[PDB]
Amino acid sequence: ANTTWNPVYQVSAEDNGNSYMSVTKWLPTATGNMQSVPLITRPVARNTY
């Protein structure tokens, strides 16, 4: 649950660009080729104390 005031980091898909989280990364091509790249695991912040 949202127990903080400042927005926690999330995993979004930026527009088609040099950005790693590009949509084209998981989008088919003119021929139909596709690829599956790793995803940001554990995006939310956790206090250890």
């Binding site: 088919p28 003119a30 139909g32 596709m34």
Partner: protein, 100 residues
């Protein structure tokens, strides 16, 4: 197991007079479909941008610029009035019925 039909053919139209001016019209339609193994093994993101017309100064409406996603699946969408009722039937409906 295999070697026996699993349905029945019927492409007619029955009129059941429910009286009071209302009539229930049931339109049955059966057809034979022909599907071929899709060429696109997987989902494609083909980008079609015609320039044979868009480049010209005069042509503006002939802008077929768009990027669709061709899927390896066909579709059985019989959303057509002519693919349900019969040519003669429509004549009777429009001449008699005032709403449907």
């Amino acid at each position: 197991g295999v070697g026996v039909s699993t349905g029945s053919y019927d492409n007619q139209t029955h009129y059941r007079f429910l009286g009071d001016g209302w009539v229930e019209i049931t339109a049955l339609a059966t057809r034979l479909v022909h599907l071929n193994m899709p060429k696109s093994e997987n989902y494609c993101r083909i980008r079609v941008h015609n320039t044979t017309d868009t480049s010209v100064k005069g042509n503006m409406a002939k802008d077929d610029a768009h990027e669709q996603i061709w899927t390896p699946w066909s579709l059985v969408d019989a959303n057509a009035w002519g693919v349900w009722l019969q040519p003669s039937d429509w004549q009777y409906i429009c001449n008699t019925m005032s709403q449907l």
